[PDB]
Amino acid sequence: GLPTELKPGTNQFLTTDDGTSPPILPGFEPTPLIHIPGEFTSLLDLCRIETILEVNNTTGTTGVNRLLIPVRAQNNVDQLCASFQVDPGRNGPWQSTMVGQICRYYTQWSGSLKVTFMFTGSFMATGKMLIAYTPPGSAQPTTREAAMLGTHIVWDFGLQSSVTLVIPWISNTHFATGIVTIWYQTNFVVPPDTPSEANIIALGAAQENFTLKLCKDTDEIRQTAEYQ
Amino acid sequence: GLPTELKPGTNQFLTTDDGTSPPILPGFEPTPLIHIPGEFTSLLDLCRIETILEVNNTTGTTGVNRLLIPVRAQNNVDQLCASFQVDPGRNGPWQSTMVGQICRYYTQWSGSLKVTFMFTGSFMATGKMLIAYTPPGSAQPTTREAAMLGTHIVWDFGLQSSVTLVIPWISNTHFATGIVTIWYQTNFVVPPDTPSEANIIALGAAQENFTLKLCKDTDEIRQTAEYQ
Amino acid sequence: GLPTELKPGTNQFLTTDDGTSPPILPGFEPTPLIHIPGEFTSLLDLCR
Amino acid sequence: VNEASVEHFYSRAGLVGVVEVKDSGTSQDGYTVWPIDVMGFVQQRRKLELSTYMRFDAEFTFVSNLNDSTTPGMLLQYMYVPPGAPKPDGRKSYQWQTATNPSIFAKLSDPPPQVSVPFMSPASAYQWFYDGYPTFGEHKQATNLQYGQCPNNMMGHFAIRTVSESTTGKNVHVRVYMRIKHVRAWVPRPFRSQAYMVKNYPTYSQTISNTAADRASITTTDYEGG
Amino acid sequence: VNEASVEHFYSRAGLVGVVEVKDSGTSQDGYTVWPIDVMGFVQQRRKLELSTYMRFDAEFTFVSNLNDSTTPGMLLQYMYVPPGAPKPDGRKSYQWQTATNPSIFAKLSDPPPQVSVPFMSPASAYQWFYDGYPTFGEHKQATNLQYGQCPNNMMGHFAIRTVSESTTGKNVHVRVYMRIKHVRAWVPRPFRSQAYMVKNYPTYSQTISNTAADRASITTTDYEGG
Amino acid sequence: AQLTVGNSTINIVLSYGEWPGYCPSTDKPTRPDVSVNRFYTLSTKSWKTESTGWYWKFPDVLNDTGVFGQNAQFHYLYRSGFCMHVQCNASKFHQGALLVVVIPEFVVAASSPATKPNGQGLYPDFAHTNPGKEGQVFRDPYVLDAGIPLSQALVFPHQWINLRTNNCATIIMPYVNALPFDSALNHSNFGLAVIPISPLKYCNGATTEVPITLTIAPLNSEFSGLRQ
């Protein structure tokens, strides 16, 4: 008979327990699987997809204009164009990325990000911007010459339409992290009878080594209305 | 189905039982181990470390002066310098050793102790002390000549700065044990323009065969205040 | 899961039952045996 | 890498719906049906809408007690009405007996009941995004009602009664916990960026909540965040 | 030699904290959170401070009953709020449902509940001695508050409620027993030689308790001890 | 009878029996080698009769000093060990003993001022937590400015300086932490305490101050995240 003895974990319903349950319909044979294209087994595969990053979140801007940042003819030299944090968890531009929404279901993440820029101006326009990355523990560079120092890429409109910047060794673990500034290197050169104002689009995504842990529930969906 | 029958040990929570419990977070992967120097798997490794033994516990003495015992120029011969029990469990000098604190979490111990002395006087000073050990069941030696008999070591300041004395076959089991006396063998010899008063430091530790059993809870931490 | 069913001998304390019980002190190592002369395993040896 | 799986992302049984069997007040008809919506609470509604297609088995658990938290050994009946069957009209209705209509008899005093529901859809997977119309009923003038609704997603019902001839004076509160298991998903979607309004329809309002927060200027990151 | 192991020295689950769910008096809001301090009682605070670094899994047990010792089959809910989540503001708060927030439903009449918590720290081991400051907040004038505090040691919370819509008139007393298991330790320390004062800070007083006892003279061992 | 590293000129206790190495490629940092690897000889402490002792915080003491101090206050992450050499210049006519002890994660404490309910927050000031290059004096050396007793401090890596015996001591400390890298500015890994167990004594006509000297060499340093 093998007499047993009950233990303190008896009569206990633990919501996270993976148990075994009797099927209510035995012998019921569900519909067989037909091949459906595009299954995804992991969320990391959804993190590696570049999605638009809304760098113009300023109060006045509404609509799709939020998704793009202006460049124009400057009457001043070496001015700053745009700046944004590198933190995908915090409230800010990264809330619009798929990475920023998918890392708000988790407590901790670590890995590298990449941020791609794309220039939508006319084919005849030329110029240079300076895209600088500032590591943690440092403040935002005051002037371009301070940003000209390490971890920058000077990017020419004529040669390439797109450019990429990788962000190393990101982690949130705690309880200023990272800043990417875009500087006017030269000026916005234009021929006659062509627009003098263009736009830049910022894309961002995780890379291979990015990871997530300790799934939690998101705070964006609160929605106190009980009718939903 | 293998019908079983419950036994009298059922629905029983025994605090010392080592059981099995469902993890509340399944699939949670904790941080991996990085090599950290200085792990210790046993308390015996902490017993073998020589720690200071406070032989001057007299009421008047305060501060670090408790940790050292005076020697000086004696106007009398063969006088007794200092004496202390060998019992690490009892209240006394051994409370300051790591062995004496770590054997107060256990009911019974057995093994050998060693007691090292170190002379802090000047390099020019010389002399001899007589360090005698008295086995259990005997009283403290009255005079030096009684102590000159077995289990003693005569120790010269000039030749060696340190000396060691091993204590055999100690056990507390029960319900006078051991005494170590330090005698002036000769006198404290000193040249001109050098201090005539020095100090001796007593160290003590367990040896390899020392063991402990039946862990209990210490009485030093009582601290009736409930704010802690 | 191997679903079982309880029987009528359940929740029963029988004083002559030889069971199994959890040790209250695990890892406690009792004093080892020294040879003691004159052990007796049976009462018949005392009857003779 | 394992904690980011879709298998792990959909795990950990949550509270699906609460239901109250009412014998007490003006009602005095003990029983309730319950639809098995799975999208009832708005927060799990997002996570499921992450994909277009889903195939999973469900495990239901029933936690029950009284107004005050007490467990005086009543008997209940958990009637699972599969899709395409009728629903009890009353407590003594003839449909509580039947067969082919699985029941669970469990006393409150017991541990909570536990059952698994297989994948019941006629198609190969569930879909909560169905473009187009289920049927031909059409000369509609303009009637847009049934757009987007799909019949294929209906999973069962649960009916619970107190198994008593006479009217009891007790109200029983039942919490339903469902655990998705053996899950596959297809065709990822974006997360819902607006507030939900109606249960079954993806309608939003004309005041458009911005996807991200706001800040002072595109240059300065100083106050609040952005 | 086995009974002196650090594995054996940290074993044998002790009483960590007691907590009282109060429905009775002026309070009448049944629920409590509890921090999971593990250092709450001064006597286990020493044994843990023996080392600098610790890595272990914990096993919690909940012993519950009424004012008088009675067990009238209520239902409770043991909500484990892991580190970095929010805490229930009330008994009907929306955070009692959620998911990813493990719960235990157990009736008082049952055996006590039993759960295991893995090693949750971001670092490789716990440390109760952290020299320096957690953050850069600094222009402090002189404000020394956060010295020595480390964020990495926070383990969860437990929230318990009575699972009742209306206010019960019962007070439930919950004892929490934790069993350290699979323990490793690094960098031994000395034992605390003074009396503890504040919970989180290693502050002592200006009247210095001697480490050993006292006696008459350094020679004579006669009366009392020394 | 001398040894030189990087144009810097001037038995051994190896802490926890492990020699400091670099971390592996896992589990691109900059390795300065002999540029920052050299002997930093800081100021000299005059040891007197009735002196309580001194202590330091080692990532902290070099923050303001030299090249290592430059990299420390600009790179975001830090890892290294230390080779620490404490010399004492005395004469055959002086007597005394020093206990040199390396306390990992040494956390200073504050003392409650005698009569008070003692519930209010008390806390060591920033001078005592980060003494800098000048070190800091024990107000209460018997408890080590913490709760732990001095007599048990021998459990840490230590060495004795007994003036009649050797006048020098050398302790090699590997990197000890719960993380592979850490912040040099905020976090202090350990500290030295030089404590005169047996007080200093001499006779009239001799030198009152005896000059304790401290010399510290970083070992296998590596840095990450260089800011401006």
Side-chain angles (χ1 to χ4, degrees), chain D residues 93-118:
Chain D
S93 176
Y94 69 94
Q95 295 166 333
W96 289 100
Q97 301 174 337
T98 65
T100 64
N101 206 30
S103 295
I104 299 299
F105 293 92
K107 287 181 291 296
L108 294 179
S109 62
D110 294 345
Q114 193 79 263
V115 296
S116 291
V117 175

PDB file of all heavy atoms in Angstrom, chain D residues 93-118:
ATOM      1  N   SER D  93     -33.775  23.587 -14.443  1.00  0.00           N
ATOM      2  CA  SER D  93     -33.892  23.297 -15.865  1.00  0.00           C
ATOM      3  C   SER D  93     -33.378  21.903 -16.189  1.00  0.00           C
ATOM      4  O   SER D  93     -32.438  21.402 -15.569  1.00  0.00           O
ATOM      5  CB  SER D  93     -33.114  24.329 -16.676  1.00  0.00           C
ATOM      6  OG  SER D  93     -33.132  24.003 -18.052  1.00  0.00           O
ATOM      7  N   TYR D  94     -34.004  21.277 -17.185  1.00  0.00           N
ATOM      8  CA  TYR D  94     -33.667  19.916 -17.575  1.00  0.00           C
ATOM      9  C   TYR D  94     -32.279  19.805 -18.175  1.00  0.00           C
ATOM     10  O   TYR D  94     -31.786  18.688 -18.350  1.00  0.00           O
ATOM     11  CB  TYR D  94     -34.685  19.398 -18.586  1.00  0.00           C
ATOM     12  CG  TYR D  94     -34.601  20.084 -19.929  1.00  0.00           C
ATOM     13  CD1 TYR D  94     -33.838  19.549 -20.955  1.00  0.00           C
ATOM     14  CD2 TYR D  94     -35.267  21.274 -20.164  1.00  0.00           C
ATOM     15  CE1 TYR D  94     -33.752  20.172 -22.177  1.00  0.00           C
ATOM     16  CE2 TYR D  94     -35.184  21.905 -21.387  1.00  0.00           C
ATOM     17  CZ  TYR D  94     -34.424  21.348 -22.388  1.00  0.00           C
ATOM     18  OH  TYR D  94     -34.337  21.972 -23.609  1.00  0.00           O
ATOM     19  N   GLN D  95     -31.652  20.921 -18.514  1.00  0.00           N
ATOM     20  CA  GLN D  95     -30.359  20.908 -19.174  1.00  0.00           C
ATOM     21  C   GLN D  95     -29.206  20.739 -18.202  1.00  0.00           C
ATOM     22  O   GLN D  95     -28.076  20.522 -18.642  1.00  0.00           O
ATOM     23  CB  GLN D  95     -30.198  22.197 -19.964  1.00  0.00           C
ATOM     24  CG  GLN D  95     -31.187  22.282 -21.092  1.00  0.00           C
ATOM     25  CD  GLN D  95     -31.286  23.660 -21.669  1.00  0.00           C
ATOM     26  OE1 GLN D  95     -31.022  24.640 -20.985  1.00  0.00           O
ATOM     27  NE2 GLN D  95     -31.679  23.751 -22.931  1.00  0.00           N
ATOM     28  N   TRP D  96     -29.464  20.836 -16.901  1.00  0.00           N
ATOM     29  CA  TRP D  96     -28.430  20.565 -15.919  1.00  0.00           C
ATOM     30  C   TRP D  96     -28.105  19.092 -15.808  1.00  0.00           C
ATOM     31  O   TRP D  96     -27.127  18.745 -15.144  1.00  0.00           O
ATOM     32  CB  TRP D  96     -28.844  21.068 -14.546  1.00  0.00           C
ATOM     33  CG  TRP D  96     -28.850  22.526 -14.423  1.00  0.00           C
ATOM     34  CD1 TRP D  96     -29.923  23.347 -14.488  1.00  0.00           C
ATOM     35  CD2 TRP D  96     -27.714  23.358 -14.224  1.00  0.00           C
ATOM     36  NE1 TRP D  96     -29.533  24.647 -14.328  1.00  0.00           N
ATOM     37  CE2 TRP D  96     -28.175  24.678 -14.166  1.00  0.00           C
ATOM     38  CE3 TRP D  96     -26.350  23.113 -14.087  1.00  0.00           C
ATOM     39  CZ2 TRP D  96     -27.324  25.748 -13.978  1.00  0.00           C
ATOM     40  CZ3 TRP D  96     -25.514  24.168 -13.899  1.00  0.00           C
ATOM     41  CH2 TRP D  96     -25.998  25.470 -13.844  1.00  0.00           C
ATOM     42  N   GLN D  97     -28.890  18.220 -16.426  1.00  0.00           N
ATOM     43  CA  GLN D  97     -28.658  16.799 -16.253  1.00  0.00           C
ATOM     44  C   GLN D  97     -27.916  16.271 -17.461  1.00  0.00           C
ATOM     45  O   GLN D  97     -26.695  16.113 -17.431  1.00  0.00           O
ATOM     46  CB  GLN D  97     -29.982  16.065 -16.110  1.00  0.00           C
ATOM     47  CG  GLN D  97     -30.817  16.520 -14.957  1.00  0.00           C
ATOM     48  CD  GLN D  97     -32.166  15.860 -14.960  1.00  0.00           C
ATOM     49  OE1 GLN D  97     -32.635  15.399 -15.996  1.00  0.00           O
ATOM     50  NE2 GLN D  97     -32.808  15.818 -13.803  1.00  0.00           N
ATOM     51  N   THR D  98     -28.657  16.035 -18.535  1.00  0.00           N
ATOM     52  CA  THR D  98     -28.117  15.674 -19.836  1.00  0.00           C
ATOM     53  C   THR D  98     -27.017  14.629 -19.759  1.00  0.00           C
ATOM     54  O   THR D  98     -27.063  13.684 -18.967  1.00  0.00           O
ATOM     55  CB  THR D  98     -27.543  16.894 -20.550  1.00  0.00           C
ATOM     56  OG1 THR D  98     -26.420  17.379 -19.813  1.00  0.00           O
ATOM     57  CG2 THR D  98     -28.577  17.982 -20.644  1.00  0.00           C
ATOM     58  N   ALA D  99     -26.022  14.846 -20.596  1.00  0.00           N
ATOM     59  CA  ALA D  99     -24.745  14.155 -20.663  1.00  0.00           C
ATOM     60  C   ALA D  99     -23.990  14.927 -21.727  1.00  0.00           C
ATOM     61  O   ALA D  99     -24.479  15.947 -22.221  1.00  0.00           O
ATOM     62  CB  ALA D  99     -24.886  12.672 -20.996  1.00  0.00           C
ATOM     63  N   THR D 100     -22.800  14.459 -22.080  1.00  0.00           N
ATOM     64  CA  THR D 100     -22.016  15.106 -23.127  1.00  0.00           C
ATOM     65  C   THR D 100     -21.794  16.566 -22.804  1.00  0.00           C
ATOM     66  O   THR D 100     -21.529  17.379 -23.689  1.00  0.00           O
ATOM     67  CB  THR D 100     -22.688  14.985 -24.501  1.00  0.00           C
ATOM     68  OG1 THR D 100     -23.931  15.696 -24.489  1.00  0.00           O
ATOM     69  CG2 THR D 100     -22.964  13.540 -24.829  1.00  0.00           C
ATOM     70  N   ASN D 101     -21.925  16.893 -21.528  1.00  0.00           N
ATOM     71  CA  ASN D 101     -22.018  18.274 -21.073  1.00  0.00           C
ATOM     72  C   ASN D 101     -21.300  18.290 -19.742  1.00  0.00           C
ATOM     73  O   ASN D 101     -21.926  18.281 -18.678  1.00  0.00           O
ATOM     74  CB  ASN D 101     -23.480  18.694 -20.945  1.00  0.00           C
ATOM     75  CG  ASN D 101     -23.682  20.161 -21.101  1.00  0.00           C
ATOM     76  OD1 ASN D 101     -22.940  20.822 -21.811  1.00  0.00           O
ATOM     77  ND2 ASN D 101     -24.713  20.685 -20.467  1.00  0.00           N
ATOM     78  N   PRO D 102     -19.972  18.247 -19.761  1.00  0.00           N
ATOM     79  CA  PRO D 102     -19.226  17.802 -18.580  1.00  0.00           C
ATOM     80  C   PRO D 102     -19.537  18.632 -17.351  1.00  0.00           C
ATOM     81  O   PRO D 102     -19.685  19.850 -17.421  1.00  0.00           O
ATOM     82  CB  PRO D 102     -17.768  17.973 -19.010  1.00  0.00           C
ATOM     83  CG  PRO D 102     -17.806  17.899 -20.476  1.00  0.00           C
ATOM     84  CD  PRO D 102     -19.082  18.545 -20.888  1.00  0.00           C
ATOM     85  N   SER D 103     -19.641  17.957 -16.215  1.00  0.00           N
ATOM     86  CA  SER D 103     -19.917  18.608 -14.952  1.00  0.00           C
ATOM     87  C   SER D 103     -18.819  18.297 -13.952  1.00  0.00           C
ATOM     88  O   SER D 103     -18.130  17.284 -14.048  1.00  0.00           O
ATOM     89  CB  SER D 103     -21.261  18.176 -14.378  1.00  0.00           C
ATOM     90  OG  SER D 103     -22.322  18.593 -15.206  1.00  0.00           O
ATOM     91  N   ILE D 104     -18.667  19.194 -12.988  1.00  0.00           N
ATOM     92  CA  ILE D 104     -17.780  19.001 -11.853  1.00  0.00           C
ATOM     93  C   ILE D 104     -18.599  19.218 -10.596  1.00  0.00           C
ATOM     94  O   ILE D 104     -19.141  20.307 -10.389  1.00  0.00           O
ATOM     95  CB  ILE D 104     -16.583  19.959 -11.882  1.00  0.00           C
ATOM     96  CG1 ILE D 104     -15.751  19.738 -13.133  1.00  0.00           C
ATOM     97  CG2 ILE D 104     -15.724  19.751 -10.671  1.00  0.00           C
ATOM     98  CD1 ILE D 104     -15.177  18.365 -13.217  1.00  0.00           C
ATOM     99  N   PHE D 105     -18.706  18.189  -9.772  1.00  0.00           N
ATOM    100  CA  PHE D 105     -19.305  18.310  -8.454  1.00  0.00           C
ATOM    101  C   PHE D 105     -18.183  18.431  -7.438  1.00  0.00           C
ATOM    102  O   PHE D 105     -17.386  17.505  -7.278  1.00  0.00           O
ATOM    103  CB  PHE D 105     -20.193  17.114  -8.139  1.00  0.00           C
ATOM    104  CG  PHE D 105     -21.410  17.027  -8.994  1.00  0.00           C
ATOM    105  CD1 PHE D 105     -21.399  16.294 -10.158  1.00  0.00           C
ATOM    106  CD2 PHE D 105     -22.563  17.682  -8.639  1.00  0.00           C
ATOM    107  CE1 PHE D 105     -22.513  16.216 -10.942  1.00  0.00           C
ATOM    108  CE2 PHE D 105     -23.679  17.601  -9.423  1.00  0.00           C
ATOM    109  CZ  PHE D 105     -23.653  16.869 -10.574  1.00  0.00           C
ATOM    110  N   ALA D 106     -18.110  19.572  -6.771  1.00  0.00           N
ATOM    111  CA  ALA D 106     -17.070  19.809  -5.790  1.00  0.00           C
ATOM    112  C   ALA D 106     -17.644  20.602  -4.637  1.00  0.00           C
ATOM    113  O   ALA D 106     -18.374  21.571  -4.845  1.00  0.00           O
ATOM    114  CB  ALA D 106     -15.891  20.561  -6.397  1.00  0.00           C
ATOM    115  N   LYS D 107     -17.311  20.189  -3.425  1.00  0.00           N
ATOM    116  CA  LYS D 107     -17.718  20.940  -2.256  1.00  0.00           C
ATOM    117  C   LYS D 107     -16.788  22.122  -2.042  1.00  0.00           C
ATOM    118  O   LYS D 107     -15.599  22.063  -2.359  1.00  0.00           O
ATOM    119  CB  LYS D 107     -17.731  20.045  -1.024  1.00  0.00           C
ATOM    120  CG  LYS D 107     -18.876  19.065  -1.016  1.00  0.00           C
ATOM    121  CD  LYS D 107     -18.874  18.223   0.231  1.00  0.00           C
ATOM    122  CE  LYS D 107     -17.703  17.279   0.231  1.00  0.00           C
ATOM    123  NZ  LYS D 107     -17.824  16.309  -0.885  1.00  0.00           N
ATOM    124  N   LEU D 108     -17.347  23.212  -1.515  1.00  0.00           N
ATOM    125  CA  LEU D 108     -16.521  24.374  -1.213  1.00  0.00           C
ATOM    126  C   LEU D 108     -15.345  23.994  -0.331  1.00  0.00           C
ATOM    127  O   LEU D 108     -14.223  24.466  -0.540  1.00  0.00           O
ATOM    128  CB  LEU D 108     -17.348  25.461  -0.533  1.00  0.00           C
ATOM    129  CG  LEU D 108     -18.455  26.128  -1.334  1.00  0.00           C
ATOM    130  CD1 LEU D 108     -19.164  27.154  -0.480  1.00  0.00           C
ATOM    131  CD2 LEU D 108     -17.875  26.772  -2.551  1.00  0.00           C
ATOM    132  N   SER D 109     -15.582  23.132   0.657  1.00  0.00           N
ATOM    133  CA  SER D 109     -14.542  22.760   1.603  1.00  0.00           C
ATOM    134  C   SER D 109     -13.328  22.144   0.928  1.00  0.00           C
ATOM    135  O   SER D 109     -12.245  22.136   1.519  1.00  0.00           O
ATOM    136  CB  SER D 109     -15.116  21.793   2.632  1.00  0.00           C
ATOM    137  OG  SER D 109     -15.556  20.599   2.011  1.00  0.00           O
ATOM    138  N   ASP D 110     -13.474  21.642  -0.285  1.00  0.00           N
ATOM    139  CA  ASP D 110     -12.390  20.943  -0.947  1.00  0.00           C
ATOM    140  C   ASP D 110     -11.372  21.942  -1.480  1.00  0.00           C
ATOM    141  O   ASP D 110     -11.569  23.155  -1.406  1.00  0.00           O
ATOM    142  CB  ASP D 110     -12.958  20.086  -2.076  1.00  0.00           C
ATOM    143  CG  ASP D 110     -13.833  18.950  -1.570  1.00  0.00           C
ATOM    144  OD1 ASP D 110     -13.779  18.638  -0.360  1.00  0.00           O
ATOM    145  OD2 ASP D 110     -14.576  18.367  -2.386  1.00  0.00           O
ATOM    146  N   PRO D 111     -10.262  21.461  -2.025  1.00  0.00           N
ATOM    147  CA  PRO D 111      -9.415  22.315  -2.848  1.00  0.00           C
ATOM    148  C   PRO D 111     -10.179  22.798  -4.063  1.00  0.00           C
ATOM    149  O   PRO D 111     -11.222  22.227  -4.412  1.00  0.00           O
ATOM    150  CB  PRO D 111      -8.267  21.383  -3.248  1.00  0.00           C
ATOM    151  CG  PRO D 111      -8.185  20.428  -2.145  1.00  0.00           C
ATOM    152  CD  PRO D 111      -9.580  20.212  -1.661  1.00  0.00           C
ATOM    153  N   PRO D 112      -9.710  23.849  -4.732  1.00  0.00           N
ATOM    154  CA  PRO D 112     -10.431  24.344  -5.896  1.00  0.00           C
ATOM    155  C   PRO D 112     -10.422  23.328  -7.013  1.00  0.00           C
ATOM    156  O   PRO D 112      -9.469  22.540  -7.156  1.00  0.00           O
ATOM    157  CB  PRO D 112      -9.649  25.612  -6.280  1.00  0.00           C
ATOM    158  CG  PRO D 112      -8.303  25.373  -5.762  1.00  0.00           C
ATOM    159  CD  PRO D 112      -8.495  24.637  -4.476  1.00  0.00           C
ATOM    160  N   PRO D 113     -11.468  23.281  -7.833  1.00  0.00           N
ATOM    161  CA  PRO D 113     -11.497  22.354  -8.961  1.00  0.00           C
ATOM    162  C   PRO D 113     -10.585  22.808 -10.086  1.00  0.00           C
ATOM    163  O   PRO D 113     -10.277  23.988 -10.240  1.00  0.00           O
ATOM    164  CB  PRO D 113     -12.958  22.391  -9.400  1.00  0.00           C
ATOM    165  CG  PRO D 113     -13.680  22.834  -8.208  1.00  0.00           C
ATOM    166  CD  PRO D 113     -12.799  23.828  -7.557  1.00  0.00           C
ATOM    167  N   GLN D 114     -10.160  21.842 -10.891  1.00  0.00           N
ATOM    168  CA  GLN D 114      -9.160  22.077 -11.919  1.00  0.00           C
ATOM    169  C   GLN D 114      -9.537  21.267 -13.149  1.00  0.00           C
ATOM    170  O   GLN D 114      -9.705  20.051 -13.044  1.00  0.00           O
ATOM    171  CB  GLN D 114      -7.787  21.643 -11.407  1.00  0.00           C
ATOM    172  CG  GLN D 114      -6.605  22.076 -12.214  1.00  0.00           C
ATOM    173  CD  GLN D 114      -6.233  23.504 -11.952  1.00  0.00           C
ATOM    174  OE1 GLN D 114      -6.612  24.402 -12.690  1.00  0.00           O
ATOM    175  NE2 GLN D 114      -5.465  23.724 -10.899  1.00  0.00           N
ATOM    176  N   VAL D 115      -9.649  21.913 -14.312  1.00  0.00           N
ATOM    177  CA  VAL D 115      -9.989  21.222 -15.552  1.00  0.00           C
ATOM    178  C   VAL D 115      -9.229  21.845 -16.712  1.00  0.00           C
ATOM    179  O   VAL D 115      -8.819  23.003 -16.664  1.00  0.00           O
ATOM    180  CB  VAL D 115     -11.496  21.258 -15.863  1.00  0.00           C
ATOM    181  CG1 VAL D 115     -12.285  20.509 -14.822  1.00  0.00           C
ATOM    182  CG2 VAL D 115     -11.974  22.680 -15.970  1.00  0.00           C
ATOM    183  N   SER D 116      -9.058  21.061 -17.772  1.00  0.00           N
ATOM    184  CA  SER D 116      -8.389  21.507 -18.984  1.00  0.00           C
ATOM    185  C   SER D 116      -9.336  21.444 -20.167  1.00  0.00           C
ATOM    186  O   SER D 116     -10.056  20.462 -20.345  1.00  0.00           O
ATOM    187  CB  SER D 116      -7.161  20.665 -19.302  1.00  0.00           C
ATOM    188  OG  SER D 116      -6.136  20.874 -18.358  1.00  0.00           O
ATOM    189  N   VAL D 117      -9.314  22.486 -20.981  1.00  0.00           N
ATOM    190  CA  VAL D 117     -10.130  22.591 -22.182  1.00  0.00           C
ATOM    191  C   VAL D 117      -9.207  22.498 -23.392  1.00  0.00           C
ATOM    192  O   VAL D 117      -8.260  23.284 -23.498  1.00  0.00           O
ATOM    193  CB  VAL D 117     -10.926  23.896 -22.204  1.00  0.00           C
ATOM    194  CG1 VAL D 117     -11.653  24.010 -23.491  1.00  0.00           C
ATOM    195  CG2 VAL D 117     -11.888  23.930 -21.048  1.00  0.00           C
ATOM    196  N   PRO D 118      -9.436  21.580 -24.311  1.00  0.00           N
ATOM    197  CA  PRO D 118      -8.564  21.484 -25.485  1.00  0.00           C
ATOM    198  C   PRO D 118      -8.824  22.609 -26.466  1.00  0.00           C
ATOM    199  O   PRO D 118      -9.588  23.526 -26.168  1.00  0.00           O
ATOM    200  CB  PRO D 118      -8.939  20.129 -26.080  1.00  0.00           C
ATOM    201  CG  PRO D 118     -10.353  19.963 -25.701  1.00  0.00           C
ATOM    202  CD  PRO D 118     -10.521  20.592 -24.354  1.00  0.00           C
TER     203      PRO D 118
END
